[PDB]
């Protein structure tokens, strides 16, 4: 049978051109009045998944 996609990882990651995955940063959902604006400003943009944890992502997203 077909492999089933981990639907949480499909809602959390998007594949880029060269096969990497973009993701949203954490820590930007609440508790935001004590955080510096510099920190948040460096947390709004999407980041790439690191080389170490990219294998578990590919295992969870076999269908890209």
């Amino acid at each position: 049978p077909k492999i089933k996609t981990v639907r949480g990882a499909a809602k959390r990651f998007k594949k880029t051109g060269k096969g990497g995955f973009k993701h949203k940063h954490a820590n930007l959902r609440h508790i935001l009045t004590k955080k510096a604006t510099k920190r948040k400003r460096h947390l709004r943009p999407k980041a790439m998944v690191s080389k170490g944890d990219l294998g578990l992502v590919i295992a969870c997203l076999p269908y890209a």
Partner: protein, 96 residues
């Protein structure tokens, strides 16, 4: 994704975005695909007859990719700037 009992990355990380239903019915077109139609006119029904975009598609853009060597009337489709210049340079006629 099991990391021991540590919170895995796909659950540490937040969800984002939604899925556009209109993107499934949009398409992008090479300039090299313009010759594969017949009649020298390019519509949605012409591209679907040439098996290029698919049936459920209702919108299509033409993108500067590849190259065309023939005058082609484009009708009812969006065209990029470079595709407009390349079509009009190759003899095309973009209309609506």
């Amino acid at each position: 994704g099991f990391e021991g009992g540590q919170m895995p990355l796909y659950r540490r990380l937040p969800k984002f975005g939604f899925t556009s239903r209109k993107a499934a019915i949009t398409a992008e077109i090479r300039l090299s695909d313009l010759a594969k139609v017949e009649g020298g006119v390019v519509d949605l029904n012409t591209l679907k007859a040439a098996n290029i975009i698919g049936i459920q598609i209702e919108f299509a853009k033409v993108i500067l990719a590849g190259e065309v060597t023939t005058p082609v009337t484009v009708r009812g489709l969006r065209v990029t700037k470079g595709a407009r210049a390349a079509i009009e340079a190759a003899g095309g006629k973009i209309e609506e």
